[PDB]
Design an enzyme around this catalytic site. Structure first.
Site, PDB file in Angstrom:
ATOM      1  N   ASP A 520       0.501  -1.509   0.208  1.00  0.00           N
ATOM      2  CA  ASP A 520       0.160  -0.137  -0.064  1.00  0.00           C
ATOM      3  C   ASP A 520       0.900   1.264  -0.161  1.00  0.00           C
ATOM      4  OD1 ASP A 520      -2.224  -2.088   1.188  1.00  0.00           O
ATOM      5  OD2 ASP A 520      -1.379  -1.735   2.755  1.00  0.00           O
ATOM      6  N   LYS A 614      -3.901  12.404  13.531  1.00  0.00           N
ATOM      7  CA  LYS A 614      -4.023  11.106  12.421  1.00  0.00           C
ATOM      8  C   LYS A 614      -5.229  11.716  11.133  1.00  0.00           C
ATOM      9  CE  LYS A 614      -5.340   6.608  11.510  1.00  0.00           C
ATOM     10  NZ  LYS A 614      -5.739   5.344  12.279  1.00  0.00           N
ATOM     11  N   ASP A 786      -5.289   2.439  -4.360  1.00  0.00           N
ATOM     12  CA  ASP A 786      -3.716   2.715  -4.308  1.00  0.00           C
ATOM     13  C   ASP A 786      -2.701   1.990  -3.286  1.00  0.00           C
ATOM     14  OD1 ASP A 786      -4.797   2.582  -1.510  1.00  0.00           O
ATOM     15  OD2 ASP A 786      -4.596   5.412  -1.207  1.00  0.00           O
TER      16      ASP A 786
END
Length: 857
Positions: A520, A614, A786
């Site tokens: 990833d 985050k 992705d």
DNA sequence: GGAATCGACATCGCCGC
RNA sequence: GCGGCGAU
DNA sequence: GTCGATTCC
């Protein structure tokens, strides 16, 4: 009584006789007949789908709130609106006490009156028995009164106060509770705001009926929707005057509903390779269902056609290559799930391991949402599992593929590899290869990854797997007896790995493995922005450059924040006590406004870490900025903190969240400078292009609002055209909908950056798929925007392929400049200056990506 | 036009009342 | 429509 | 309480 499509309609997909001699010859007759069958079934499922839906729709008179009844109403409402209009003038042009109904009907906006009638009627008509012109008339009136009474709020009273209402009103569902809220509101607003009476208590059920009655008249007068015929004329207790639905208008709805029901199929996997995409439509599935797959999931048919003759060979290659990957059900995993799921809602949610009101009611509302969630989660889990079991024994299954308007690739069937842990765990590639040394090594990397050990160098990942060799073999031997696997970040995927790992132990490096190992990309968005502007600092933050340790952008943003916190705890502004006078009481009060010094102290007091930053940074590429961060912080850490006991330091939650947002914005904008500038530019371009430049001396349109167009590196063209309707019809507690459209400048400006990047990573993914298939012999792919995967034996090459494909694209194209050429000559004469120059490049050397370990992709 | 203010996190898809 | 869930 | 542009006063 809807016209069943389940006739010669779906029969069309004759799984027995049709020019399918193609399939037959290509993969045999059996499979051929099954695919057509399966495809046929999908439409039957879609049909039943629309059916049960249409059921509840009527079951609550929400028949108006259905696409089956909206076409007519769109043409029935004008007729009605006019009738009332004329009728209003007919009474005004005549002296003498006007009619009873006219008195009230003069207050409610005619448009709403017309509509209210139509809707409430249909609701009654679709009632088991009572359809008496008596009850109906009361209904319409009751509905009109509510509108005139509480509508007054949405008009004068809450001219602006309405803001603190709408939010909570729409939040409310069901006519009943929507009334409860409007009543309490009225009881308050009168207690403070606009003063007056409540001239509706006077509306004795008499007025109500009179109103309802006059409307029904006008209804039957302007259009022919309901017949007023007598029921059992000549009976003391049966002679009841009632209403019946126009026979014709009941047939249209049934016909519209019917046809509709045949365009919403529940797409499933394929039992034979998908039909190669050769043009804008007809690809993917084989049968000729009346719901043909588009190569691009566009909003408007017009939008689709723009692709009709576009030349993009590489795009088609990619989509076809991908779509051709053969998959199969990981039986060993299905066994495990088939068992433990009948024991737990969510097989992995609870395994044995070793401000007053605005706080309790807070938790209460969570309890409710939580259980609602657990119920929706289980619905979907049930579906996938059903779907898995269904195909558990096919030697292979395939998934057709599409693209959204921006170029991202999506699997078409509801059950697909781009699912979630369980779904992905239940899926594995059909054609594997002898694993070999190399492949085994990647097998274990992936295992570490599935267990969450992905923020450490590969040798530490291999170490982790080797130290747990016994745990793994245990979970593989007796998965129901060892819960260790269920405790990892990606439980089923992990378990899938466990089995594959155990196979190698028993069989050796010759073991034929087909498990899809996924690579990833870190923050694809910020990755691409950092590449296209050669940003070294940001690029390094997202693992673009080779480093010995993995870089954690959430943590580096976190550290920068703490630097400011410290800085503020030392220096920084002091609190300030402003004066506040209540609007209702006029009560003088002292409230202190917290300075940075005090706010810093709280956050230090709380302890700031990657968890606090985050979400904000990962949503940066979706357009969120300082403002958007307040919400996130307020409910992602400040809220739960207080609700969990902590949070004591957070005296003024909002003041504390606003401060943090300011700090997180300051920290990111200096960590990923390229990402922030690119988006600002892209935003600026879309702004101009979507503007309606005119000469404010003529009010003349010199340049109409233009859409934004560009082309990805691999040839895919994209057109961003968010349109805004010029209509308007907001209802209070009943409905409020439909009534030309123009480019919506705000959405145009808010979706440009995220959409650009996505288009960009979409082209990277396709390029990778093609490169890896032609250069290396890779032919099985696991794609998730992705994330790229293949069988172990080909993992090492895909790992190389994704970097090469990324380095090449950005060495060959300045997507931003190319973007500029595209719109440049579309900027009216007067806006050729507000257009910021293209942000300067940096010192990153794309070639370093080829040696970056932690940038899978 | 000086501000009242809607907008503020993007796309895709499923289910539900 | 709003609400819930999932993918990136 | 940020950053701006559709739109009201």
């Amino acid at each position: 009584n809807t016209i069943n499509i389940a006739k010669n309609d779906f029969s069309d997909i004759e799984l027995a006789a049709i020019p399918f001699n193609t399939l037959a010859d290509h993969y045999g007759e059996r499979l051929a007949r099954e695919q057509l069958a399966l495809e046929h079934e999908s439409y039957e499922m879609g049909e039943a789908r629309f059916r049960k839906m249409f059921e509840r729709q009527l079951k609550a008179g929400e028949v108006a709130d259905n696409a089956a009844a909206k076409p007519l109403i769109t043409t029935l409402l004008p007729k009605m609106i006019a009738r009332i209009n004329d009728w209003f003038e007919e009474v005004k042009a005549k002296r003498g006490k006007r009619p009873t109904a006219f008195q009230f009907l003069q207050e409610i906006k005619p448009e709403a009156v017309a509509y209210i009638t139509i809707k409430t009627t249909l609701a009654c008509l679709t009632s088991a028995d009572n359809t008496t012109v008596q009850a109906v008339a009361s209904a319409i009136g009751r509905a009109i009164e509510d509108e005139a009474r509480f509508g007054r709020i949405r008009d004068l009273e809450a001219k602006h106060f309405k803001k603190n209402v709408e939010e909570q009103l729409n939040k409310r569902v069901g006519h009943v509770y929507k009334k409860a809220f409007m009543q309490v509101v009225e009881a308050d607003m009168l207690s403070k705001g606009l003063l007056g009476g409540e001239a509706w208590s006077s509306w004795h059920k008499e007025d109500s009926i009179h109103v309802g009655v006059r409307c029904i008249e006008m209804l039957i007068e302007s259009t022919g929707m309901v017949s007023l015929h007598r029921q059992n004329a000549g009976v003391v207790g049966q002679d009841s005057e009632t209403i019946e639905l126009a026979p014709e208008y009941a047939e249209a709805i049934a016909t519209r509903a019917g046809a509709l029901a045949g365009i919403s199929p529940m797409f499933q996997p394929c039992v034979v390779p998908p039909k190669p995409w050769t043009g804008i439509t007809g690809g993917g599935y084989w049968a000729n269902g009346r719901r043909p797959l588009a190569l691009v999931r566009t909003h408007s048919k017009k939008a689709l056609m723009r692709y009709e003759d576009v030349y993009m060979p590489e795009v088609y290659k990619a989509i076809n290559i991908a779509q051709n990957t053969a998959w199969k059900i990981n039986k060993k995993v299905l066994a495990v799930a088939n068992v433990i799921t009948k024991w737990k809602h969510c097989p992995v949610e609870d395994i044995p391991a070793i401000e007053a009101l605005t706080a309790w009611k807070r938790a209460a509302a969570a309890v409710y949402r939580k259980d609602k969630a657990r119920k929706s989660r289980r619905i979907s889990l049930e579906f996938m599992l059903e779907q898995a079991n269904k195909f558990a024994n096919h030697k292979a299954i395939w998934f057709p593929y599409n693209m959204d308007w921006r170029g991202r690739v999506y699997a078409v069937s509801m059950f697909n590899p781009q699912g979630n842990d369980m779904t992905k765990g239940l899926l594995t590639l059909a054609k594997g290869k002898p694993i070999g040394k190399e492949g085994y090594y990647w097998l274990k990397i992936h295992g570490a990854n599935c267990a969450g050990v992905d923020k450490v160098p590969f040798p530490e990942r291999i170490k982790f797997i080797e130290e747990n060799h016994e745990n793994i073999m245990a979970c593989a031997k007796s998965p129901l007896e060892n819960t260790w696997w269920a405790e990892q970040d990606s439980p089923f995927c992990f378990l899938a790995f466990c089995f594959e790992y155990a196979g190698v132990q028993h069989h050796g490096l010759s073991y034929n493995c087909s498990l899809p190992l996924a690579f990833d990309g870190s923050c694809s968005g910020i990755q691409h922005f950092s590449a296209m502007l050669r940003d070294e600092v940001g690029g390094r933050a997202v693992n673009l450059l080779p480093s010995e340790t993995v870089q954690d952008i959430y943590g580096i943003v976190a550290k920068k924040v703490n630097e400011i916190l410290q800085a503020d705890a030392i220096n920084g502004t002091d609190n300030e006590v402003v004066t506040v006078t209540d609007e209702n009481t006029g009560e003088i009060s002292e409230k202190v406004k917290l300075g940075t010094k005090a706010l810093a102290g709280q956050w230090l007091a709380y302890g700031v870490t990657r968890s606090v930053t985050k979400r904000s940074v990962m949503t940066l590429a979706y357009g969120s900025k300082e403002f958007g961060f307040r919400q996130q912080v307020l409910e992602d850490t400040i809220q739960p903190a207080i609700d969990s006991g902590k949070g004591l330091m957070f005296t003024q939650p909002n003041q504390a969240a606003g401060y943090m947002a300011k700090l997180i914005w300051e920290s990111v904008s200096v960590t990923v400078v390229a990402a922030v500038e690119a988006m600002n530019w892209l935003k600026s371009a879309a702004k101009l292009l979507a503007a309606e430049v005119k000469d404010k001396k003529t009010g003349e349109i010199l340049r109409k609002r233009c859409a934004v167009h560009w082309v990805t590196p691999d040839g895919f063209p994209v057109w961003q055209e968010y349109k805004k309707p010029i209509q308007t019809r907001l209802n209070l507690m009943f409905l409020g909908q439909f009534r030309d459209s123009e480019i919506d400048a705000h959405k145009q400006e808010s979706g440009i950056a995220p959409n650009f990047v996505h288009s960009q990573d979409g082209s990277h993914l396709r390029k990778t798929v093609v490169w890896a298939h032609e250069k290396y012999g890779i032919e099985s792919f696991a794609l998730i925007h992705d994330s790229f995967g293949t069988i172990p034996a080909d993992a090492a090459n895909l790992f190389k392929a994704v970097r090469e494909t990324m380095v090449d694209t950005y060495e060959s194209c300045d997507v931003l400049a190319d973007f500029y050429d595209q719109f440049a000559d579309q900027l009216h004469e007067s806006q050729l200056d507000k257009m910021p120059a293209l942000p300067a490049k940096g010192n990153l050397n794309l070639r370093d990506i080829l040696e970056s370990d932690f940038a899978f992709a």
